[PDB]
Amino acid sequence: PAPTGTVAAAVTDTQVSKDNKFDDTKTLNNAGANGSLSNSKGNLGANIAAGSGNQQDNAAAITSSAGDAATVFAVADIYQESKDNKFTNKGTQNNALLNNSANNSSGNVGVNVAAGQGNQQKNNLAIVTADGKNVAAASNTEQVSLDNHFLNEASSKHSYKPQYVVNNAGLLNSANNASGNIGVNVAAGAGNQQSNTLTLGSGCT
Amino acid sequence: PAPTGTVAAAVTDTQVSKDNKFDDTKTLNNAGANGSLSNSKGNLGANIAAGSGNQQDNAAAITSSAGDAATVFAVADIYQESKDNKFTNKGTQNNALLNNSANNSSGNVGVNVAAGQGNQQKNNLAIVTADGKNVAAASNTEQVSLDNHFLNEASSKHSYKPQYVVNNAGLLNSANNASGNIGVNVAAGAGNQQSNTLTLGSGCT
Amino acid sequence: PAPTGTVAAAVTDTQVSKDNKFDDTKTLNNAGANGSLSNSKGNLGANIAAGSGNQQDNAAAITSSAGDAATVFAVADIYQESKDNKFTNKGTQNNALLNNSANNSSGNVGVNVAAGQGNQQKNNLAIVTADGKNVAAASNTEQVSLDNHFLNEASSKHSYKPQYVVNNAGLLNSANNASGNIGVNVAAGAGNQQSNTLTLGSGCT
Amino acid sequence: PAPTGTVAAAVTDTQVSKDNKFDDTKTLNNAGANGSLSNSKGNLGANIAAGSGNQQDNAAAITSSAGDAATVFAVADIYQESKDNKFTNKGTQNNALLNNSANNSSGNVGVNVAAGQGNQQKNNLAIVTADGKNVAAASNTEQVSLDNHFLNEASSKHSYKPQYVVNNAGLLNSANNASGNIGVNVAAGAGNQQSNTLTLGSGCT
Amino acid sequence: PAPTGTVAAAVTDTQVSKDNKFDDTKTLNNAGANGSLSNSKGNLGANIAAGSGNQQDNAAAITSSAGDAATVFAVADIYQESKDNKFTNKGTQNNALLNNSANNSSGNVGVNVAAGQGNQQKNNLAIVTADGKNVAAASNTEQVSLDNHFLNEASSKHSYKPQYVVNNAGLLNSANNASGNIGVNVAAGAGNQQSNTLTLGSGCT
């Protein structure tokens, strides 16, 4: 038979991971994770991980605005694996913002970013000014993961003023006034695998 | 017979998972999960998980506004699996908002986001400006899951002021003034599988 | 059969790594990591690592502005590996900014930069003024990693004024008003592998 | 078969290294490392290492401005290796700037520069005024490294005024208003390997 | 077979070295190392070493300005080796500038210069006025090195005014408004190997 095998364009990702804890212990936290994509015009993957043993794949393809326009053809592929223990603080006062993402953005974004260990990733993005054949894709993803807990923990001796903690926590608002394709997908804790694909056209006259 | 097998376009997801608890222990919580999709114009999947051992698939295809218009064709596929123990806090005071989603959004959104561990996902989205052949889809999904409890737990010694807890909990309002196709599907607790597909056209003159 | 083997153009990276801790101990920190890509027009990989045992690959290809335009063809390849222990401070007061990246940039950027040890990398970038065949790519990546924790730690004797710490922490905002393809992917802690590819055209008349 | 072996043009670098610490001890530091590439027009590799056991390779090829234009063809190759202990200060007051790089530069730059020991490197650069065939490259890199920590450390006897330290730290901002291809990749600490390639054309009329 | 062996034109350098310390002890330093290449038009290698056991190779080939133009062909080769102990001061007050390099230069420069011992080097440079075949090169470099630390150290008896030190330190800024190919590569500390090649043409009408 004919050498048709070059027709095997797309498989997004495949992965394994296994692990325990994200934590924190004493006095001040002005502290919180992410929040995503307000007023943006395009394709956005927000992927974030506070915690360890991390892997991800993202793909994204765009038409941005209206006018004279061109051709588009995109492809992506990976496999990746990890195993891990913890994320932890003791006793730092924390003016500690973990990473708010991609407001008023245009085109393609992978915000794919971490605090933690044993990190791997694959990022892949494309803009055109294109109209006509718009949305085509094929075959996509596979995955596995095995694990425990997001957590805060604290203990101390019976001093005159024991157990002193002060803390304040945002986690993950999404997509307000967004236009396009928005994938927000974030974790807190270990053992993270994520897969994505996005395809678009929009404008005005 | 003819090589017709390329006609096998669509199967959404298949999965297994099994696991125990989402919890919390001492003093302040100003704290609550999500809430969804007020005044939005499009296709939205809200998927959220506080708790571990997580997997999801989302697909979404759109026509947004009225005017000159184009062709649409979308496809998606995955299988994925996980197993896990807990989500937990001890003794953090919590200004702790878990993630309110996708109000005043347009086009396509997957808000697919977690606090917890052993995470896998596949996200897939598409806008066109398109009118004519609108809604077609085929064959779709398969699933399994096996588990225990969402939970709050607390105990302490007989001190002068024992058992001190203060807490406040929103869970999941949906779709107020929304137009389009809205899938809101969220969990609190472990062992999460979710599947989705959405297809649309709307506007005014 | 014919000597077709020169058709083997692309594989992005493959890697292994395994390791423990990013930390810090006594008195002042005015200190924080990165933040990325505001108002930029192009292809940007932000890769940053505070912590050790580091490896990365980046590729990026661009069309910048509109006018008379030319041909584009880019290729990249590596394998690399590392293993490590820690990142740590004791007792320095710290006016200590770790590296904010690539605002108001144009064309291609790899900001690929570290504080820590056992460092390897491969960077690869290209601009053209090009219109026509825009987005093509093939076959891409492989990866592995195995590890522990981001961490702050502190202990001291019972002096008249014990446990003196003062600290303030930014981590990683992304992509505000950006146009083009933005990959932001940063770590804090050891054991870092990252892979990227970006492809574009945009302008105005 | 024919003597085709001269077609073996490109392999960028291959390396090994393994090592411990960058540090500092008593009284004044007005002190900080690098910062990179503001307003530059071209191909820049910033490679810097405070710390020992160092190796690097850089390649870079350019078109600068628009007008009558010529042909381009570039090639590079190395292997290199090192092993080391430390970087350290005791008790110098320090008006100590480590090396800010390549602002308002044009053409090609390798800023490849160190403070520390067992140093090896290979630098390679080329400008043309060229338009037509722009971006071609092939086969690229290999690497390994194995190590410990960036660090500040301090101890002293119980004098009338013990533990006197004063210090102030910039590390590595990048690419502001840059045009072209920018690789910024710097380390602090020992055991450094880095690899790079860049290719371009830009101008105005 | 034919006597083709004369086709073996290029190998840049190969080397070994191993060693300990750069230091300094008591009272005044108005003192600092190098800084490089502001407003220059050409090919520059800055190589500098405060510290011992030194070896280097540089090659550089140029087209300078536009007009009637000629042919170019350059070649270079060496191997060299060294082993050493220290660089050190005690008690000199120091109006001590170590060597700022090659600002407003044209054509080719090797600034290749030291303070320290067991010194070897090879320098090689060429200008033409040439246009046409511009950038060709082949096969390049090999290297090894093994070592310890850059360092300041000080101790003294308990006199009425002990530990008197006063010091001020520039290290290595690069390439501001430079045009051409700039390799800046400098060390402080022992055990130094460096390799370079540069190729160019630029002008105006």
Curated annotation (Swiss-Prot), chains A, B, C, D, E:
GO terms for biological process: cell adhesion. Residues 63-93 are annotated as: Linker 1. Residues 128-166 are annotated as: Linker 2. FapC_R repeats lie at residues 29-62, 94-127, 167-200. Keywords: Amyloid, Cell adhesion, Fimbrium, Repeat, Secreted, Signal. Disruption phenotype: Deletion of just fapC in an overexpressing strain yields cells without amyloid fibrils. Deletion of the entire fapA-fapF six-gene locus shows no visible growth phenotype. It comes from the Bacteria. It is found in: Fimbrium; Secreted. Its main location: other. GO terms for cellular component: extracellular region; pilus. The major functional amyloid subunit in this bacterium. Intrinsically disordered in its monomeric state. Upon overexpression of the endogenous six-gene locus (fapA-fapF) in situ, cells form large clumps during liquid growth, make large amounts of biofilm and produce amyloid fibrils. Expression of the 6 gene operon in E.coli strain BL21(DE3) induces flocculation and biofilm formation with copious extracellular fibrils. The major component of purified amyloid fibrils. Forms fibrils in vitro; in the presence of FapA the fibrils are about 50% wider. Interacts with FapA. Fibrillates in vitro; this is inhibited by FapA. Fibrils are resistant to boiling in 2% (weight/vol) SDS and require >90% (vol/vol) formic acid to dissolve. Each of the three repeats is modeled as a beta-hairpin; the repeats and inserts are modeled to stack on top of each other, overall forming a beta-helix. Soluble monomeric FapC is predominantly disordered. Belongs to the FapB/FapC family. This is Functional amyloid subunit FapC. The lineage of its organism: Bacteria, Pseudomonadati, Pseudomonadota, Gammaproteobacteria, Pseudomonadales.
